[model samples]
Target: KNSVSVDLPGSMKVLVSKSSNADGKYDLIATVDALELSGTSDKNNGSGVLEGVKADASKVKLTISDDLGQTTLEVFKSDGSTLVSKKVTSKDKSSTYELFNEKGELSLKYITRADKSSTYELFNEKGELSLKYITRADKSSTYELFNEKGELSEKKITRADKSSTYELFNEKGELSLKYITRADGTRLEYTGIKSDGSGKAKEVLKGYVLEGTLTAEKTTLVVKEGTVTLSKNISKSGEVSVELNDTDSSAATKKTAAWNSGTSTLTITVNSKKTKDLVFTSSNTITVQQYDSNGTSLEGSAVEITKLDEIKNALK
Candidate 1:
């Protein structure tokens, strides 16, 4: 037999034997216990496994018993390294953790959750995870990459919603870019802006200003064609009414526009009273229902119609 048998301090002996010439490799043979390892043999209703094989090449098997359940873990060692670990559960027959490398440096771990989601990990020389993949119950999966320093460098995700965002970082751990996609498949770009200043400068307008005049003839009033300075945009609608106000002997009459626009016209009815006690007020109301834009109305397509009132109280 191409084998070596080792007899230890006690009556314990372990044999490391080579396989047949056809197989051409050494294999572990039998291990005889000097005194049978002592443990409870009741075979409790619930059984679990929790075992560990150390880097010193020693193996350990553990069985735990409690009011709720019992667990057992069997670890085996070879060539000063962990060789195998087997775990079994009462309800889960497929979940397991296995050490694969002869240096006792690598482990293949797996877990099956109650919802059937599975997790897996590949550990490196330090027994730390070098790579891992996880699948959720919804079948969404993700991949993670680690740097040489064991820092997380990148992550890729496959989501159930099928929409995702990606974040990239620089070597110095500064955020570089973000790629975000909306549910409508539109990609949005964002940039960071930083500034330090007092505030925004103020703006002022300077130009010519215009004035206007009005003339009266009995019940007919005419506005002299001139320019009137305005502050902002103006709008007008409906029928307009005009009224002439005679306050003093100066015979000053005021004209008011019922609607809003660039220019307005008014016809005033005059009263023949020039005395302080004789107060003559001529009032005309202009009412409009429909409007057009041929030097008349504003233009727009709207589901609902709108009306605006422009009253121009003036003195002539």
Candidate 2:
């Protein structure tokens, strides 16, 4: 072996080496501690490794295995901490790329699985999974996200049939919401379990406008077009009272009413006049005739004096 070194400006030096083989060819050239380029020739194609590469004063490393069948490239920080790595395998036609955090922990990865599906994963500072995306062999895809506690917080899935679903979970790992879309229809649902161990779910049906609120003691639901509202309340004695109203119409023109265990009242008003006829039904039924502004009964109105006495006592 023979070696020769030549000093250059900027504190750089070049060293060249000649192999001991009969050829005596120059097989290696190194630029001080900054770069090393080497090559070896066998019966087949040649191979090489290059190290300490510098670009913009930052160091990089590269390696190519025999016959150029495999290759790797890496970047590092000034303090020698790994920044990223990329590797390719010619035999499998696969590549893997990785990223590292400042502490040298692997923070991200992109690779192709054996089945030819691509996958991407992200990690937190503690090396815990934070997010992942994958494409399956059947052309389906899924994306998952995790909380700091490493718990699955949300997921979205798209099927090969073009359907899709999205799901969410609470910190307690309970399913909180789910939405699905299929070829035929779509649905969105919200669900929760109360501390008392009671579960409730609200769902939106396809092609229908629905809005509602439900609680342990009461529920109100509305069916949107010309909107009819239905509300029910349950008393401690297990008596349920229901009320219905047509929101599309004025209070005078709409069929609005209320009912309970003790009494039921119905009021009807005509035209723009404030005069209203009220019918009250209970153990004793009575109708209050509409009156004019002067307190006189209107044309078609008639009040039985006996009914007035009953209403007077009931009011007391």
Candidate 3:
């Protein structure tokens, strides 16, 4: 019956031992309405190890693992609703943080993985994901942002090769604009280019397009497409235009056109059975000169055109 009864200022008492003569202080454990605990790793003024905090009073809580490898902090709103929770895991070198808006709807989430990859997500008050960002181990990243209706508004991707692509979408998520930069060159594509705002895409020329003709050269080029046909004027009792044949004369000379975007030059095989380099030096200037298959320049055949209508009228 040797029970211990100790009174405290707050009218609290040290509990009795569960058994008689149990002098062990460990048997003095008591259940109280509330308890406050404080400790230090090195025993100075260090932080406390607080865990199992109930939300009945809508209080903030910070919990940590025994090994100090994982810690999680949570906050509650005035109405006892959860507002945010941030967890840090030292073992995996990862962290996950989530936030809720005043209405207790999830608004944001940020996570980091062991591979050094990260993902960030933003949500609207209605809990709809509106923006997201992800980065991989190799530093390649992608970001997607959406509108309130959950339609993709824009997206950007940066690759490890230093190349990047950015795309923008219309309200309906139809592709509106796309821009890409790579090792070769940059390309820009646009949609809804028509005046009426229809979804049809208009052809955007990346190279060049020379449709009608060039004066002084007596030649016409239908270079509107990637492949073009070049013909010369022949006075066969009439100003008839025909394929310029090679000197071999055994069969029709099958020639191919090549393009050089570096100098905006169109190299076409001309009828003298020679190669003609069409250099568009300026918007209204074209320098056409004939060259042998070996790239030997034929000086006298060089002709410059100042206007295209001259060649069109000549063809007529």
Candidate 4:
């Protein structure tokens, strides 16, 4: 095996080169054209191509150029379409590399900034930015995804402190949902709005716990246990009403009670029957004495009372 080396100043050009037998016969091992060496001059632009001897087969080309204070190197497919391009800009001190699809459309790009941060972007077939990931100088990272219509679909961000936030958007580009986690805890929020001006936002929190106060024009609170249901309705006029029901039985046969705050009155009703006027005297208690329908107290009557209290007292 033999090897030859050549060192040239500035640029070197070779019109043709080939391998030969020891007898000086052209053995045709490999051949290269000098035109492939044109770009290495001080002209700030250069290109070279390596192709198969049979012609028109798959090949690769390298291109170097300096444009607008940026130096770039590009690799191309045999069809003259760009495969990949890397660029470094003097002003920003950043390096960017781009990858192209078979159709010559940009598919992916990566950028390294002067601050040692980096970003990556991906594009769809339609040339729309589909995804992007960025790492900041502070070591935090963020990712974003876009819909085919060029609307931002989702975004996720992570901080250096290990906190993270994620956001999702609707097709209309409005934020529809968000989730965030921090040192303390986590939080989630969802929002929707209609064209008719109706909208709602809901939030959930976990951490030190979430506490909130709500005020409403009119509110109703309902509690259910087994077959019993209790409901309280508070109106804007400062009026509060409560209702209790036993769903297992008829409403008429169920015992019901009502209290009025305006008059401080309490009323009890049973089986559609109303008791006679029961009044509490100044003694702070109501005295009830069994009586006949004719307004006669049972204590003054000759009728025998079979009351358990009387029997027990008598036995004593």
* Overall lDDT per candidate, in order of appearance: 0.38, 0.54, 0.52, 0.48
Q: Report residue 274 deviation for candidate 3 (angstroms).
A: 3.6
Cα RMSD, each candidate: 23.8, 17.1, 15.6, 20.5
**Candidate 4 residue spans exceeding 4 A from truth:** 1-58, 62-73, 81-94, 102-105, 113-115, 170-174, 184-316
The C-alpha TM-scores of every prediction are: 0.31, 0.48, 0.49, 0.39
lDDT of 2 by residue, 45-123 (tens): 2234445746555556555565555656566776545575544444455667788887877788988755778889999
Q: Please write out the lDDT profile of model 1 over residues 1-316, one tens digit for every residue.
A: 6655533221233344434344443333333232222222222222222233455556755444443232345567644234565453333333455557657554677765657677778787777787677888887777665655676665556576654555554455444444444434433232231122111111111121112211121112222312211111111322223333333343233222222222333222223222111111112122222223232442333111111112122122
Find the candidate with the highest lDDT and give its number. 2
Model 2, residue pairs in steric clash: none
Summed over model 4, clashes come to: 2
RMSD of 4: 20.5
Candidate 1 yields a Cα-based lDDT of 0.38
| Better-scoring candidate (lDDT), 2 or 4 | 2
Better of 2 and 3 by TM-score: 3
Give the backbone clash total of model 2: 0
